[PDB]
Coordinates of C-alpha atoms in Angstrom, one line a residue:
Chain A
X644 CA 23.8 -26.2 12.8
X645 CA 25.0 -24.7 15.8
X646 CA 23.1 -21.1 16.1
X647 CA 20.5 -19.0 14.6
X648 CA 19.8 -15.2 14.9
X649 CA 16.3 -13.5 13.9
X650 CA 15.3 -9.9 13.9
X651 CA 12.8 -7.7 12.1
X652 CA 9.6 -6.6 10.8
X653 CA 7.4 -9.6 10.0
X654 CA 10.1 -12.1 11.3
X655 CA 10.3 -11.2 14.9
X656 CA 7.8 -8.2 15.4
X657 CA 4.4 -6.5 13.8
X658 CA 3.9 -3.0 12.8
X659 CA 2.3 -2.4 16.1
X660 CA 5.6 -3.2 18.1
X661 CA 7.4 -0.7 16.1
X662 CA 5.2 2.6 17.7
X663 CA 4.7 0.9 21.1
X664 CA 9.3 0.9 20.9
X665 CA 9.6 -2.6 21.0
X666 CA 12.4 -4.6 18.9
X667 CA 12.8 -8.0 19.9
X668 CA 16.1 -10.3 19.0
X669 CA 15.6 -14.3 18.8
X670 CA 18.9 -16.5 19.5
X671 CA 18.4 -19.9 19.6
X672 CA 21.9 -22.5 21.2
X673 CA 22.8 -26.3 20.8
X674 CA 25.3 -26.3 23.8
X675 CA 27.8 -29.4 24.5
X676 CA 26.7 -32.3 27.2
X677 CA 28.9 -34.4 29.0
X678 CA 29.9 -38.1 28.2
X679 CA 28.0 -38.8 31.5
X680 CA 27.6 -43.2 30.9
X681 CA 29.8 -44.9 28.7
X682 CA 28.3 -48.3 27.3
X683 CA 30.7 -50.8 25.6
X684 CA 28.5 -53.0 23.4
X685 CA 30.7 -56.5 22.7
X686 CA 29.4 -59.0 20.1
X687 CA 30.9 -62.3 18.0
X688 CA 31.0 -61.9 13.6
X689 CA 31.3 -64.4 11.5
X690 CA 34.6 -65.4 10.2
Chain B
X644 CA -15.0 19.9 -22.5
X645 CA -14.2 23.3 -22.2
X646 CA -17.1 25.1 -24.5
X647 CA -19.9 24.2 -27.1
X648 CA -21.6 26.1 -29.8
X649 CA -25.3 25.9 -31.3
X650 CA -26.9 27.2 -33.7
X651 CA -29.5 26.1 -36.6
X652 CA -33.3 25.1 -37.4
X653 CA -34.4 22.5 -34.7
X654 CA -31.9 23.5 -32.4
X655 CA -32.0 26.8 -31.4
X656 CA -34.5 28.1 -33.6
X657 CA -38.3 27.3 -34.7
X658 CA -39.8 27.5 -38.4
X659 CA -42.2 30.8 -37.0
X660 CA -38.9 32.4 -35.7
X661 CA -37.3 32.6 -39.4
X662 CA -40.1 34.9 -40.8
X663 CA -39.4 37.1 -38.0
X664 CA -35.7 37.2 -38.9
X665 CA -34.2 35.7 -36.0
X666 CA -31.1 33.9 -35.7
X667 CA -30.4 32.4 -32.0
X668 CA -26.6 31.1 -31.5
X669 CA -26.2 29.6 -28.1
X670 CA -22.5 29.6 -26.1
X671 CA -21.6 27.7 -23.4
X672 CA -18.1 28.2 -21.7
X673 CA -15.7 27.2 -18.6
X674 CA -13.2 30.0 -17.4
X675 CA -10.6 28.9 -14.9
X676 CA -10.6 30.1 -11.1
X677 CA -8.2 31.3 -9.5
X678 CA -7.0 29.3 -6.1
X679 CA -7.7 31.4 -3.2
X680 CA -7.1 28.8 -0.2
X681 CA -5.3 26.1 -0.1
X682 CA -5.5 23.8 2.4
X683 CA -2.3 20.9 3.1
X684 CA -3.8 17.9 5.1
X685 CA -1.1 16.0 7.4
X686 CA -1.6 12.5 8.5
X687 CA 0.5 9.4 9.4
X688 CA 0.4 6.1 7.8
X689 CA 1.8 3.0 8.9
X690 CA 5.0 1.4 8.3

C-alpha cells in the first residue's frame, strides 16, 4: 500500500530501448501529510 | 529416391525391337557430392 517498484522488458521498456542503452526504473510514493485543520463534529443521540 | 530401374515390353522396348533381339534396361542414379565451400552466415536477431 505504501510503494511500488517496476523494471524490465515489456513492463518498463521495449526491445528497442535495450540497443539504444536505455533501462528505465519506475517508483511510485504515498508520503505522510500534516493534520493541518482539525474539525470537532458534536451531535445529540437518543437515549 | 536415390535410383530406379526399367526394363520390359512397353517400357523400354517396342514389339519390332524383340525380333531384332534387343533388350534395353534403363538406370537412373544419385551419387553424393562432396562439400567444397562452405559458407557460415552471421546475423543478429532481436531480444
Amino acid at each position: 500500500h505504501a510503494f511500488y517498484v517496476k523494471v524490465g522488458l515489456g513492463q518498463t521498456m521495449t526491445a528497442q530501448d535495450i540497443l539504444e542503452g536505455n533501462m528505465n526504473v519506475e517508483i511510485g510514493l504515498a508520503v505522510v501529510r500534516p493534520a493541518e485543520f482539525i474539525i470537532l463534529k458534536f451531535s445529540h443521540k437518543m437515549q
